[PDB]
Structure 1
Amino acid sequence: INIPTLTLMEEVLLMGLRDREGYLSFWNDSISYALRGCIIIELALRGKIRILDDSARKRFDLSERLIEVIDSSKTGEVLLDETLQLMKNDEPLSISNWIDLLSGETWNLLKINYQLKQVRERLAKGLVDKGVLRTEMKNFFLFDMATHPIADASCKEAIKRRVLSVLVSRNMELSYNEYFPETTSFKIIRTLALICGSYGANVLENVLTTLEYEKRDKAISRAEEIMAQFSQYPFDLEKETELGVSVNLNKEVKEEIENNPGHDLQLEVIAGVFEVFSRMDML
């Protein structure tokens, strides 16, 4: 009711999905990794984790700070739940340390089973069961493959429109649908999450390509600004943009945080993940 229908993991997949012949969409070591960022961002907004409140942490990069489990009760998201399981039964590890373990970018034989298998297909069963995707068989010469064509095109359309509202509107005014109601906690935070996630996942640009290039360039930049601003805690909400895009982002984000108080330890985790998204070139 305050948690929206789709997980950020799902939204990013959609940002990657083609309209026609979607199994032929581009899958790569980037999207895969960024979905793990997402898993942790998500768990943060859901109040399951927070950074460990040790003032020592302030001497270390945001992405290297340890986090702890506030709350280990099932979310109903299989992907989230399973990582929550791993987290419950272990010492506090750092954000990138978790993102790495869950992606198996890490190489200690000790924590082999920490890596999440079947993300794409479980993410797609989710998209199917939620009605965003259909399921139909295409018969190739030697086999049939299950195909998951878009069932509801209006779903991704709103995702896209939220991005556009933040990266091309001069004034961010966000549209709410059944999937993403006005009564959604941290709605802008979550939109900024989706953008940065998509950016790291290397699918942000997909959503802008029809625009004239000045507008596409500006958008990319805007995202990069947002990524700077929100990849440090407390968020700099004072650096007004020189770009003339979402000129109201600071006022609204401020208000959003104001109305949603005493959550900094969770908002910090997010700047952490946002930091990780910045350093994704290094894969």
Structure 2
Amino acid sequence: NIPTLTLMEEVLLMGLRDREGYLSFWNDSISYALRGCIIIELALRGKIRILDDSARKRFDLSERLIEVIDSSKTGEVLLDETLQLMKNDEPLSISNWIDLLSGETWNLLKINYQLKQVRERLAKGLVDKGVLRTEMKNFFLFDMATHPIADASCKEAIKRRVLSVLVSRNMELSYNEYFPETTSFKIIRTLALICGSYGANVLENVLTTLEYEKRDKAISRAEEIMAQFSQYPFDLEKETELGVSVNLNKEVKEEIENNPGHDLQLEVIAGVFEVFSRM
């Protein structure tokens, strides 16, 4: 079922350089996308679902309310702690959750939902996972913890998956220890990766190698897939004019068919995609 790295962690990984240091200066765009991954992640793990009233249809996807379906611990603190919050509140919309957890809306009687030390906790988790090691750099006025990458294969595998969907003619996802051949919702997870990393604005980081025609094609293909998968139900009949991942429609159809009765959750991820494009 569930892969080793969460989406938040793959997105974080997306902003780092292969050896030491970083590519993206830390902005609140990335910090907002990560809250998005959290919500996507909750839906994937069958813990939340779009609130089941047909009256939601009069509203945008991202304006639609979410329902805690299962409040049992998940393992992941960031996930668990937002879950906690959800279990104790009226059904709120996707957009509202993302705001509150970002500290981007202001609410008095909500004090407070804003998630704290996300960056740092994601990093600690990433050490425990063994993706990052810890190095103690020595500065002029203090010592400092530092987390350069330990396993390069991890970042490389993510890169290839992403490219598999957005440069290569036929998407063929590769697998490994962190992301096995048997993870449920495999294609949606990687789509979710691209859509997250687009709105965190860290997606272009994996594209800097490529020749110019291919970097263009990847970005447009990316916004193409954002257009499709931020409406519900998905438009799986619309064919790509580009020469890129021409079999995604087929491969998704085969995936949702073999995970039936999950529609009430796929719709939340779509709302989240909607928020990523609006950002």
Task: Determine if the TM-score, normalized by the shorter chain, exceeds 0.5.
Answer: yes
Aligned residue in 2 for 1:20: 19
**Where has structure 1 moved over 6 Å in runs of 4 or more?**
none
CA drift at 1:26: 1.7
Change (3 A) 1:205 1:25: closer
Q: After superposition, what is the alpha-carbon deviation per residue over 1:80-129, rounded to whole angstroms, capped at 9, x for unaligned? A: 00000000000000001000011110111221220000000000000000
Aligned residue in 2 for 1:189: 188
- Within-5 A mapping of 1:161-172: 161-172=160-171
CA drift at 1:23: 5.9
CA RMSD after TM alignment? 1.0
Structure 1: gaps of 5 or more residues: none
CA drift at 1:24: 7.4
TM-score (norm 2): 0.98
The answer to whether the 8 A contact 1:165-1:171 is kept is yes
The answer to whether the 8 A contact 1:18-1:25 is kept is no
Rounded Cα–Cα distance in structure 2 between residues aligned with 1:43 and 1:94: 14
Q: Report sequence identity in percent.
A: 100
CA drift at 1:52: 0.6
Rounded Cα–Cα distance in structure 2 between residues aligned with 1:87 and 1:153: 36
Structure 2: gaps of 5 or more residues: none
Change (3 A) 1:17 1:82: same
Rounded Cα–Cα distance in structure 2 between residues aligned with 1:49 and 1:187: 19
TM-score (norm 1): 0.97
The answer to whether the 8 A contact 2:15-2:23 is kept is no
The answer to whether the 8 A contact 2:15-2:22 is kept is no
The answer to whether the 8 A contact 1:104-1:112 is kept is no
The answer to whether the 8 A contact 1:44-1:269 is kept is yes
Rounded Cα–Cα distance in structure 1 between residues aligned with 2:264 and 2:54: 12
The answer to whether the 8 A contact 1:136-1:149 is kept is yes
Q: After superposition, what is the alpha-carbon deviation per residue over 1:167-206, rounded to whole angstroms, capped at 9, x for unaligned? A: 0000000000010001001000000000000000000000
Rounded Cα–Cα distance in structure 2 between residues aligned with 1:20 and 1:145: 17
Rounded Cα–Cα distance in structure 1 between residues aligned with 2:216 and 2:111: 41
The answer to whether the 8 A contact 2:20-2:149 is kept is no
The answer to whether the 8 A contact 2:19-2:148 is kept is yes
The answer to whether the 8 A contact 2:14-2:205 is kept is yes
The answer to whether the 8 A contact 1:49-1:67 is kept is yes
The answer to whether the 8 A contact 1:23-1:147 is kept is no
CA drift at 1:19: 2.5
Q: Which moved more, 1:132-141 or 1:17-26?
A: 17-26
